[PDB]
Structure 1
Amino acid sequence: MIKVEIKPSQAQFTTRSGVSRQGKPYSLNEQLCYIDLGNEYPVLVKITLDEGQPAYAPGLYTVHLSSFKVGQFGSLMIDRLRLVPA
């Protein structure tokens, strides 16, 4: 299991916006977190949230299976990091 932490300072998201190739508006909400990748300290990672989802509250989390998909070359890829409480 991957250990993800949302620190007290990371409790908010920011929003970027724009227009798709054929005219549709979009909005993307982004939040930061720390992930332990086995180095001396956890590293900073950007998360893009799914539509209609609030920012994750401070605390410890792990990664949900729905984060992964098989890519166009047949290998596993991350789609979006989706988190669940630890």
Structure 2
Amino acid sequence: MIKVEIKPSQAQFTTRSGVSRQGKPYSLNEQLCYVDLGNEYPVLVKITLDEGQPAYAPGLYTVHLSSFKVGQFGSLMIDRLCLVPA
């Protein structure tokens, strides 16, 4: 259904960090990918990995149902995009 691609130039992440409101240090790892939204060319999207998960290797993925949730106004929304091999 949604086609996601990790290019060889995107095979690993960068880390961003800081301090939580209850003074706890956080760290978020982010990776770039291309999602085909049906336009002439795929679009660049940023994804945030969960703790202990490595960057996805190059290749083709699709989106896991766990990426979605019901939001605060009752409509569906993406929480965090989770990729599974195509």
TM-score range, shorter chain: over 0.9
What is the CA distance between 1:36 and its match in structure 2? 0.2
Tell me the distance in 1 between the aligned counterparts of 2:12 and 2:33: 11
Tell me the distance in 1 between the aligned counterparts of 2:22 and 2:85: 38
Tell me the distance in 1 between the aligned counterparts of 2:22 and 2:10: 34
Match of 1:45 in 2: 45
What is the CA distance between 1:29 and its match in structure 2? 0.2
What are the Cα deviations for residues 4-62 of structure 1, in whole angstroms up to 9, with x where unaligned?
A: 00000000100000001120110000000000000000000000001110000000000
What is the count of residue pairs matched by the alignment? Answer: 86
Structure 1 moving runs of 4+ over 4 Å: none
After superposition, where does 1:1-86 map in structure 2 within 5 Å? 1-86=1-86
Tell me the distance in 2 between the aligned counterparts of 1:51 and 1:79: 15
TM-score scaled by length of structure 1: 0.98
- Residue ranges of structure 1 left out of the alignment (5+ in a row): none
Query: Equivalent pairs: percent with the same residue?
Result: 98
Q: CA RMSD in A?
A: 0.4
